[PDB]
Amino acid sequence: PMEEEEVETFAFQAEIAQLMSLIINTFYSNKEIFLRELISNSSDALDKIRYETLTDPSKLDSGKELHINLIPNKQDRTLTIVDTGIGMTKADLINNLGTIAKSGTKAFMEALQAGADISMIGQFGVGFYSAYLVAEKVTVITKHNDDEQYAWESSAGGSFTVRTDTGEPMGRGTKVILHLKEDQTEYLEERRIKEIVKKHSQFIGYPITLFVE
């Protein structure tokens, strides 16, 4: 019958767009750290739902398992990071992922100019953008107990779109889908992924499972 679907296109905050251009158009050596950042974000989100459930157990109606799943897809060339954390509401997505200024962006771009390793990105509260070190496009599927499921997305270039997600329902949590650049396919390999996790994300307070096709 043909369905209609609303979309809204936003502009990244000025310094955030510059950061993205920087990340994307400059060569960096320690790119493997992008995974550490996404996993850290998931651990934070899982902590939030866990603590919230202490006072309100019905918050787990949407799922009780608290875990992280890594899903490499060699056909698609996508690396998906899924967590059953607190998730993001529409407002969270828009405010947290692009629209509101971050206080560490400036100091961080300054540091990279001077030669800092991108691994430093964590400290500055702008770690999510490290995803652009290996990905040309990033999709964020998210579901929060207080809102419907939403899909965030951008190939950078200064804007990102947000829409209600009519795709496969998640229950609760966040799914980061990385559409990897052609020269970054090593991150689809199970040996490589396990190497990075062992090296940088060993002390995660929740189980991580790697699903290999």
Side-chain angles (χ1 to χ4, degrees):
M2 164 167 239
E3 300 289 59
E4 175 180 327
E5 274 186 26
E6 179 180 75
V7 186
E8 182 156 17
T9 314
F10 301 86
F12 280 110
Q13 189 271 151
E15 279 69 61
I16 285 176
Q18 295 169 189
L19 176 59
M20 295 184 66
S21 315
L22 242 211
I23 296 300
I24 294 176
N25 301 283
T26 306
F27 172 89
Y28 294 110
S29 238
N30 206 14
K31 298 203 213 62
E32 61 179 70
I33 63 84
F34 80 89
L35 225 211
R36 176 193 69 203
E37 298 301 326
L38 300 179
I39 289 172
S40 306
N41 283 340
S42 297
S43 48
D44 287 0
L46 284 162
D47 281 344
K48 291 176 171 80
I49 182 67
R50 177 167 62 89
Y51 281 91
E52 283 184 38
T53 65
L54 299 178
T55 40
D56 189 8
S58 51
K59 294 182 179 306
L60 290 177
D61 284 359
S62 40
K64 297 174 180 177
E65 283 177 296
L66 299 182
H67 54 128
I68 303 183
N69 295 338
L70 300 188
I71 318 158
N73 188 308
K74 300 177 182 63
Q75 292 79 52
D76 236 34
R77 202 207 282 166
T78 57
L79 182 61
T80 309
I81 297 77
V82 190
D83 69 56
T84 48
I86 196 70
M88 291 179 270
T89 57
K90 193 192 181 169
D92 278 348
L93 262 187
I94 306 164
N95 291 302
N96 289 15
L97 295 186
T99 275
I100 298 294
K102 295 290 177 161
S103 49
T105 314
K106 293 187 187 193
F108 185 49
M109 294 191 287
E110 200 157 83
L112 289 186
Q113 302 313 136
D117 186 80
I118 25 70
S119 195
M120 300 291 105
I121 199 164
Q123 307 278 40
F124 297 87
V126 284
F128 172 85
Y129 303 101
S130 61
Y132 289 94
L133 290 168
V134 299
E136 57 190 12
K137 171 173 62 185
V138 171
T139 306
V140 182
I141 309 294
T142 200
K143 175 60 174 73
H144 186 108
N145 289 325
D146 301 331
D147 217 338
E148 298 165 283
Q149 190 166 295
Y150 279 84
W152 179 104
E153 195 181 71
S154 61
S155 289
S159 306
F160 66 92
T161 65
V162 173
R163 80 198 66 195
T164 303
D165 186 27
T166 48
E168 292 178 3
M170 282 191 319
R172 190 198 63 250
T174 300
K175 173 161 69 181
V176 181
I177 310 170
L178 307 175
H179 299 74
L180 308 174
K181 293 189 261 289
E182 67 179 340
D183 66 341
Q184 306 293 147
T185 58
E186 65 184 87
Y187 299 114
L188 292 177
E189 290 299 335
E190 56 266 35
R191 174 211 157 295
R192 182 67 174 131
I193 294 174
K194 292 184 299 179
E195 175 182 21
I196 301 168
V197 171
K198 186 65 154 61
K199 193 181 302 174
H200 302 113
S201 304
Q202 64 278 72
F203 297 162
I204 293 312
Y206 303 95
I208 305 183
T209 303
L210 177 57
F211 292 103
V212 55
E213 0 89 88

Coordinates of all heavy atoms in Angstrom, one line a residue, residues 162-195:
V162 N 17.4 11.4 12.0 CA 16.8 10.7 13.0 C 15.3 10.3 12.6 O 14.7 11.1 12.0 CB 16.7 11.4 14.4 CG1 15.9 10.6 15.4 CG2 18.1 11.6 14.9
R163 N 14.9 9.1 12.8 CA 13.6 8.6 12.4 C 13.1 7.5 13.4 O 13.9 6.9 14.1 CB 13.5 8.2 11.0 CG 14.1 6.7 10.8 CD 14.4 6.5 9.3 NE 15.6 7.3 8.9 CZ 16.0 7.6 7.7 NH1 15.3 7.1 6.7 NH2 17.0 8.4 7.5
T164 N 11.8 7.3 13.5 CA 11.3 6.2 14.3 C 11.6 5.0 13.5 O 11.6 4.9 12.3 CB 9.8 6.3 14.5 OG1 9.4 7.6 15.0 CG2 9.3 5.2 15.4
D165 N 12.1 3.9 14.2 CA 12.5 2.7 13.5 C 11.4 1.7 13.4 O 10.8 1.2 14.4 CB 13.7 2.1 14.2 CG 14.3 1.0 13.5 OD1 14.1 0.9 12.3 OD2 14.9 0.1 14.2
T166 N 11.0 1.4 12.2 CA 10.0 0.4 11.8 C 10.6 -1.0 11.6 O 9.9 -1.9 11.3 CB 9.3 0.8 10.6 OG1 10.2 1.2 9.6 CG2 8.4 2.0 10.8
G167 N 11.9 -1.0 11.8 CA 12.7 -2.3 11.6 C 12.5 -3.3 12.8 O 11.6 -3.0 13.7
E168 N 13.4 -4.3 12.9 CA 13.3 -5.3 14.0 C 13.4 -4.7 15.4 O 14.4 -4.1 15.7 CB 14.4 -6.3 13.8 CG 14.2 -7.2 12.5 CD 15.4 -8.2 12.3 OE1 16.3 -8.3 13.2 OE2 15.3 -9.0 11.3
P169 N 12.3 -4.9 16.2 CA 12.3 -4.3 17.6 C 13.4 -4.9 18.4 O 13.6 -6.2 18.4 CB 10.9 -4.8 18.1 CG 10.1 -4.8 16.8 CD 11.1 -5.5 15.8
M170 N 14.1 -4.1 19.3 CA 15.1 -4.5 20.1 C 14.9 -4.9 21.6 O 15.7 -5.4 22.3 CB 16.3 -3.5 20.1 CG 17.2 -3.5 18.9 SD 18.5 -2.5 19.3 CE 17.8 -1.1 20.1
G171 N 13.7 -4.5 22.1 CA 13.4 -4.8 23.5 C 13.9 -3.6 24.3 O 13.1 -2.8 24.8
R172 N 15.2 -3.4 24.5 CA 15.9 -2.3 25.2 C 17.4 -2.4 24.9 O 17.9 -3.5 24.9 CB 15.7 -2.4 26.7 CG 16.1 -1.1 27.4 CD 16.3 -1.3 28.9 NE 17.3 -2.3 29.1 CZ 17.1 -3.6 29.6 NH1 15.9 -3.9 29.9 NH2 18.1 -4.4 29.8
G173 N 18.0 -1.3 24.7 CA 19.4 -1.2 24.5 C 19.8 -0.4 23.2 O 19.0 0.3 22.6
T174 N 21.1 -0.5 22.8 CA 21.6 0.3 21.7 C 22.4 -0.7 20.8 O 23.1 -1.5 21.2 CB 22.5 1.4 22.2 OG1 21.8 2.3 23.0 CG2 23.1 2.1 21.0
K175 N 22.2 -0.4 19.5 CA 22.9 -1.2 18.4 C 23.7 -0.2 17.5 O 23.1 0.7 17.0 CB 21.9 -2.0 17.6 CG 22.5 -2.8 16.4 CD 21.5 -3.9 16.0 CE 20.2 -3.4 15.3 NZ 19.4 -4.5 14.9
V176 N 25.0 -0.4 17.5 CA 25.8 0.5 16.6 C 26.2 -0.3 15.4 O 26.9 -1.3 15.6 CB 27.1 1.0 17.3 CG1 27.9 1.9 16.4 CG2 26.7 1.8 18.6
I177 N 25.8 0.1 14.3 CA 26.2 -0.6 13.0 C 27.2 0.2 12.3 O 27.0 1.4 11.8 CB 25.0 -0.9 12.2 CG1 23.9 -1.5 13.0 CG2 25.4 -1.8 11.0 CD1 22.6 -1.6 12.3
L178 N 28.4 -0.4 12.1 CA 29.5 0.3 11.4 C 29.6 -0.2 10.0 O 29.9 -1.4 9.8 CB 30.8 0.1 12.1 CG 30.9 0.4 13.6 CD1 32.2 0.0 14.1 CD2 30.6 1.9 13.8
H179 N 29.4 0.7 9.0 CA 29.5 0.3 7.6 C 31.0 0.7 7.3 O 31.4 1.8 7.0 CB 28.6 1.1 6.7 CG 27.1 0.9 7.0 ND1 26.5 1.4 8.2 CD2 26.2 0.1 6.4 CE1 25.3 1.0 8.2 NE2 25.0 0.2 7.2
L180 N 31.9 -0.3 7.5 CA 33.3 -0.2 7.3 C 33.8 0.3 6.0 O 33.3 -0.2 4.9 CB 34.1 -1.4 7.7 CG 33.8 -2.1 9.1 CD1 34.5 -3.4 9.1 CD2 34.2 -1.2 10.2
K181 N 34.9 1.1 6.0 CA 35.5 1.5 4.7 C 36.2 0.3 4.2 O 36.6 -0.6 4.9 CB 36.6 2.6 5.1 CG 36.0 3.8 5.6 CD 37.1 4.8 5.7 CE 37.7 4.9 7.1 NZ 36.7 5.6 8.0
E182 N 36.4 0.3 2.9 CA 37.0 -0.9 2.2 C 38.4 -1.3 2.8 O 38.6 -2.5 2.9 CB 37.1 -0.7 0.7 CG 38.0 0.4 0.2 CD 38.1 0.6 -1.3 OE1 37.7 -0.4 -2.0 OE2 38.4 1.7 -1.8
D183 N 39.2 -0.4 3.2 CA 40.5 -0.7 3.7 C 40.6 -1.1 5.2 O 41.6 -1.3 5.8 CB 41.5 0.4 3.4 CG 41.2 1.7 4.2 OD1 40.0 1.8 4.6 OD2 42.0 2.6 4.4
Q184 N 39.4 -1.2 5.8 CA 39.3 -1.5 7.2 C 38.6 -2.8 7.5 O 38.1 -3.0 8.7 CB 38.6 -0.3 8.0 CG 39.2 1.0 7.7 CD 40.6 1.2 8.3 OE1 41.5 1.9 7.7 NE2 40.9 0.6 9.4
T185 N 38.6 -3.7 6.6 CA 37.9 -5.0 6.7 C 38.6 -6.0 7.8 O 38.0 -7.0 8.1 CB 37.8 -5.7 5.4 OG1 39.1 -5.9 4.8 CG2 36.9 -4.9 4.4
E186 N 39.8 -5.7 8.2 CA 40.4 -6.5 9.2 C 39.6 -6.6 10.5 O 39.6 -7.6 11.2 CB 41.8 -5.9 9.6 CG 41.7 -4.6 10.3 CD 43.1 -4.0 10.6 OE1 43.6 -3.3 9.7 OE2 43.7 -4.2 11.7
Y187 N 38.8 -5.6 10.7 CA 37.9 -5.6 11.9 C 36.7 -6.4 11.8 O 35.8 -6.4 12.6 CB 37.6 -4.1 12.2 CG 38.8 -3.3 12.6 CD1 39.3 -2.2 11.8 CD2 39.6 -3.6 13.7 CE1 40.4 -1.5 12.1 CE2 40.8 -2.9 14.0 CZ 41.2 -1.8 13.2 OH 42.3 -1.1 13.4
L188 N 36.7 -7.3 10.7 CA 35.6 -8.2 10.5 C 36.1 -9.6 10.9 O 35.3 -10.5 11.0 CB 35.1 -8.2 9.1 CG 34.4 -6.9 8.6 CD1 34.0 -7.0 7.1 CD2 33.2 -6.7 9.5
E189 N 37.4 -9.7 11.0 CA 38.0 -10.9 11.3 C 38.0 -11.3 12.8 O 38.3 -10.4 13.7 CB 39.5 -10.9 10.9 CG 39.7 -11.0 9.4 CD 39.1 -12.2 8.8 OE1 39.0 -13.2 9.5 OE2 38.7 -12.2 7.6
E190 N 37.6 -12.5 13.1 CA 37.5 -13.0 14.5 C 38.7 -12.9 15.3 O 38.7 -12.5 16.5 CB 36.8 -14.4 14.6 CG 37.6 -15.5 13.8 CD 37.0 -15.7 12.4 OE1 36.6 -14.7 11.7 OE2 37.0 -16.9 11.9
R191 N 39.9 -13.2 14.7 CA 41.2 -13.1 15.4 C 41.5 -11.7 15.8 O 42.1 -11.5 16.9 CB 42.3 -13.7 14.5 CG 43.7 -13.6 15.1 CD 44.7 -13.4 14.0 NE 46.0 -12.7 14.4 CZ 46.1 -11.5 14.9 NH1 45.0 -10.7 15.0 NH2 47.3 -11.0 15.2
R192 N 41.3 -10.8 14.9 CA 41.6 -9.4 15.1 C 40.7 -8.8 16.2 O 41.2 -8.0 17.1 CB 41.4 -8.6 13.8 CG 41.7 -7.1 13.9 CD 43.2 -6.9 14.1 NE 43.5 -5.4 14.0 CZ 44.2 -4.8 14.9 NH1 44.6 -5.4 16.0 NH2 44.5 -3.5 14.7
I193 N 39.4 -9.1 16.1 CA 38.4 -8.6 17.1 C 38.8 -9.1 18.5 O 38.7 -8.4 19.5 CB 37.0 -9.1 16.7 CG1 36.6 -8.4 15.4 CG2 36.0 -8.8 17.8 CD1 35.3 -8.9 14.8
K194 N 39.1 -10.4 18.6 CA 39.4 -11.0 19.9 C 40.7 -10.3 20.4 O 40.8 -10.0 21.6 CB 39.6 -12.5 19.8 CG 38.3 -13.2 19.5 CD 38.4 -14.7 19.5 CE 39.4 -15.2 18.4 NZ 39.6 -16.7 18.4
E195 N 41.6 -10.0 19.5 CA 42.9 -9.3 19.9 C 42.7 -8.0 20.5 O 43.3 -7.6 21.5 CB 43.8 -9.1 18.7 CG 45.1 -8.3 19.0 CD 46.0 -8.1 17.8 OE1 45.5 -8.2 16.7 OE2 47.2 -7.9 18.0

